[model samples]
Target: CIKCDQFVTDALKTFENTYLNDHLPHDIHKNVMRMVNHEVSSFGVVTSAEDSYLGAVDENTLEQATWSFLKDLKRITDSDLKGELFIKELLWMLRHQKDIFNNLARQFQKEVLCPNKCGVMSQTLIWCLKCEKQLHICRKSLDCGERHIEVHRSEDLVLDCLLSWHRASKGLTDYSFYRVWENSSETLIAKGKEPYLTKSMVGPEDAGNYRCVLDTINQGHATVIRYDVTVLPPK
Candidate 1:
């Protein structure tokens, strides 16, 4: 319960708020607040089970996480150089400002056009994925019976972000209950705790419109990783 609660409420809420956004301030990130009701009950349990986020092997989830946040490293920094710099410097002040975001301020790298967001991860109870792009979950539907569904869904969800996170403002990736699929044993994949990026391990395909926002500490600005994936037409 702790793990699952941390993921959906913390991770997912942050992702949806930071990225997968539209509009000026795009303040709608707070909308994940809506998911709070469903998060605490069996709905959480069933969804986690169906998605293989609870009992699945860690390798599978971790691999997917690596793939979800899958960036060339170079690619990740190119656009966010300034934000990254801001983040480095802020890390130093961690001692001085540890509780700033605790007041509901977004992380330093994060700039709330409206202010008072605190990092996406700030609200979580447990830490799942890392701040890098590897922190992510994939979701998609397959047309097949039970067995085929497993393979197809695995391939799809691992490759892409769950539809729940795909919606621009309506998405729910930033909730306190949210967590990256591969970052923990909540998924069927094992080795998520290992945080490895070897080619043999990582999410398979990519899901479109998924956002990876930081669950950082403090307020100022937010750090985010967002991307998409395509599925080939079925044979």
Candidate 2:
């Protein structure tokens, strides 16, 4: 649906390049997607006690754990054990992704507004930018229609515009933004200036490969990172 959910997005990065093969097919993907919102152990994210040693996981530690697991995978000379390790690591990754869905659901509950003005607030509605002006019936309570229509969680999510940028250089003068066009369209989508750290509005149009350049009197250095911007669509 919206951005393929965070788990797939994150796992694809760490495991897709190294582990995705005929062994892991659409059946496994489908099964995992169906249970992404449920408890971790409910699915096969954690199948053993040692694997479940970490009771709860946040994204940061999950990243570190995945990295460590991958590193350990290289050391195992036995191919069978390596494959088992890969599956286990992947399951843990998928299990921890439930947290992402939980947080997103919490955010939706706190932020979603009832379009019908019937005093019903819930997260089971979709939203559209163009629908800001069009009348829509509230799914929570079909009492009165209004100028806002929302859909389900799957279709109507704004991309999460979260990125990390560092500005604490010892001595930096100017900053420049770059965008790598997908095709011959040589126009920059995301442009930034000096104070473009966090707290900047990101939109779907801003999703692209970007680079940050720092200019100093001593020397000009270019710092490039995965500027993967998630623009939760504007309401």
Candidate 3:
């Protein structure tokens, strides 16, 4: 329910695209949606893993894995090893994702609330001004959601904003003052004035296709942040 749950959100979405989207029209999607529904079932009901979300996946690696998996589909006739690579890679991805979930759950517990120095802080859940569609298309670039966009991880941009605001609005409304860590390194960032990378502003005509690096600490990698990102807005 909280934006701090970006770890959760990211994982679940990753699961959907990597696993569900790829093998739809088969029984798998039905099976997964049933899982999503069950989790929402009953008063205060919880869903099972199979029925719930697949969890935040590393979209970049997974697409590469997906590509590797399907590249031979048009020609392979082994019948046994044909698409096995995808299943193997996807399974590997899922296993690693479980690690991400565990780390996020722990991190949120350790989180501190926003100071909320500013009055009821909120901003428009900004969508790009260019395409005028919901964010998914904005992120995927290739017109099809299957082939993940390499240059722009736009959804991560949205996730970054969501996570930032989640902390900003702790006990407040969804739209609240959000103060996130800022980086003035980009040439795009104004010369010397240090700025807090806040939530996205609606109707950003100048927001071009950009990418950001997020640090999800759970990864145990140097940048412990779970999300590394920057999304380019259509210019």
Candidate 4:
């Protein structure tokens, strides 16, 4: 029932058009091309749904877009001090924008990776609880009644990254423990979005006053917590 004369030909032209070049990142478009396959149909056929790029979200996904977004900002200015502060506020804005965009992307990934991938298809989709990882579950036992099978099968996936980002974005206090890393000189050694942090497990050389800050932009309030951490020489 689907036309082929111009339909088949035009589709390729449109897919390969300047729209791709103008709209998406160069690498992303190339990734799309590999997943899509144009096939001919039953009637003078020229296309199959399998050849389409409709369900290839798992292949080329976003990783730390904020890092990519911030990389762009780094190219514009030279002042590290001022730029540090500037980038913080810029990150706040970018994070807000990303929250909106990622919501749509997350929904799409979930849909495209849905368990319906089971059935007669060769592909498998597993849902994990520990890390909350999904997509590409084992095809071996798609209907295994064993609910508590080995979880956290693969490393962090799209959903894992999303959840981790949300966890980190919840602010410093949301965590059970806040770590402080530094030298006796009062210089910052390292700081991560994680709460429990202990670096090296070395001696007194790492003593410093640990400070945690919560800059709630929307809440319009900044809360600071400090703990003096002094490592003493072993008796």
Candidate 5:
């Protein structure tokens, strides 16, 4: 078919013009081309290795090995291998040469790479802006809902309202006297001297509309901050 032929040709061109560049090690270039040729000539079917060199690994190891190949390729070509187009090409390669690529990745992981482990903590806190009594009351009453904010899974999220009343008043009074509620059912989520609401490792359950109201010493209680949080799956 024309579609299959065109795809094979493009894949071949990518290997020739990109992966088989002069900068790549001679042995690696030769091995990759040998693999590509075998797959192409065999009509998109990858032949099993003659020897018992193919080893199985967990999903994490497989992912890390694949990233190692991408990183090296990017280092050689000075181009990123992400996005829809490159991912589609990559999927085609994986579909055709799953075992072959897995064996290559296994070898790379065993010989050329060292596993590194570290702990990293990241948090995101978005502050609500200046307050408008009428606009705020309208939004609170109408409850049309808050603005959408996408948060990645397993990351900390904080909705801050410390400065929500800064523009409305002169001196900085401890506006920590506030309440956070799940806006849908008007259910109170948190109430304390804390000016912000924190959700550790946000998940699907944490996604919803949240409202924060300030209880000023002088002024009456008023809605100050709102958020419509959406949790995104980790990539």
Candidate 6:
């Protein structure tokens, strides 16, 4: 409850101010104020014989609200390096107030901004190859099937191999690493905690099946994501 109260106070002070002291542009300031008002209004309410008051926003609800605000901010700012930097600044501010924002920022940068900059879209909570690009936060593993992804020749292809593994393993223990392989020849493509299999200026040779796995000490290897990429001829 105390946490929720503090969140409310901090949000009002930081985001809902009318003065121009924060150096935010007019549009950004209005949007931030709108988000704060919406979230605070939806918080739980309590009524008694004396008067009515707002109750504490639970942790789960507060996390959801924060994510919703960030997602909206992403759309408001659009997909650009400058907007990305601004969001980073906002995340830094939130991180100082709540520990949950740390994880939220990490996931948002990896799953939303990174893929967005690469011209690919993350449609669901768990990142995957889909025709349409959307951003979301995944709580569990999505269906692990061979997803069909089409890209124009000479365009970039970014395959994220760590997000699902990170979710499945409960934040990626030090003993585990994310690995991706080109399935046609069973050759290793990349390996790390945040492995992203990227093909710059992709050509016909890059069209094939790819696999991602979580290589761990205790559980051995487990496939987490797969994609069947098709590189189309450019006009």
lDDT of each: 0.28, 0.36, 0.30, 0.33, 0.46, 0.47
Q: Clashes in each model (backbone N, CA, C under 3 Å)?
A: 62, 11, 32, 11, 0, 2
Residues 128-177, candidate 3: write the lDDT tens digits.
11212111111111111111222232222232223233243212222211
Question: Once superposed on the true structure, which residue ranges of model 1 sit more than 4 Å away at CA?
Answer: 1-21, 24-27, 36-44, 47-54, 65-235
The alpha-carbon lDDT assigned to residue 69 of candidate 2 equals 36
Q: Write the per-residue lDDT of candidate 2 for residues 1-235, one digit (tens) a residue.
A: 1122245345444443444443355446445444433333232133456533222322333444445433443332223433446456545655444444334434433443232233122222222111122222223322222212222322332222212222222233445545556773443333444434332344465554544444443433423332434444544
| Top TM-score model | 6
Q: What's model 3's lDDT at 2?
A: 17
Ranking by TM-score: 6, 5, 2, 4, 3, 1
Query: Candidate 6 at residue 58, lDDT?
Result: 23
Task: Looking at model 2, report the run of 10 residues with the lowest lDDT sum.
Answer: 127-136
Candidate 6 regions exceeding 4 Å error are 1-143, 162-184
Candidate 4 structure quality by residue, lDDT tens digits, 80-184? 323235435444544453453344345545654433322111122122111122334212222212111111222211101011222312222222223455543
**Residues 1-235, candidate 6, lDDT per residue (tens digit)?**
2224345455456444533233456667667556545434433333554212122222343455456555543443343334436646554434333344334434444444323211112223321111122233223343345567899999998876554334423223221222234543576666666656677999998887777665444433433567788899997
True-vs-predicted CA distance for residue 77, candidate 3, Å: 20
Q: State every prediction's TM-score relative to the real structure.
A: 0.17, 0.24, 0.22, 0.22, 0.32, 0.34
lDDT of 6: 0.47
Model 6 RMSD in Å is 17.1
Cα lDDT tens digits for candidate 5, 1-235: 1113334456457766765454455555556566555543432122467422232332333344445444443443454444444434544554445444455545744642322121111111111111111211111231223556788999997887654223333222332312234553566667766777787998888777777665544334433456778889986
Q: Is candidate 3 or candidate 6 better by TM-score?
A: 6
Worst 10 residues of 1 by lDDT: 140-149
**Error at 62, model 2, angstroms:** 20
Pitting candidate 2 against candidate 5, the one with the higher lDDT is 5
Candidate 3: segments with Cα more than 4 A from true spot: 1-82, 113-235
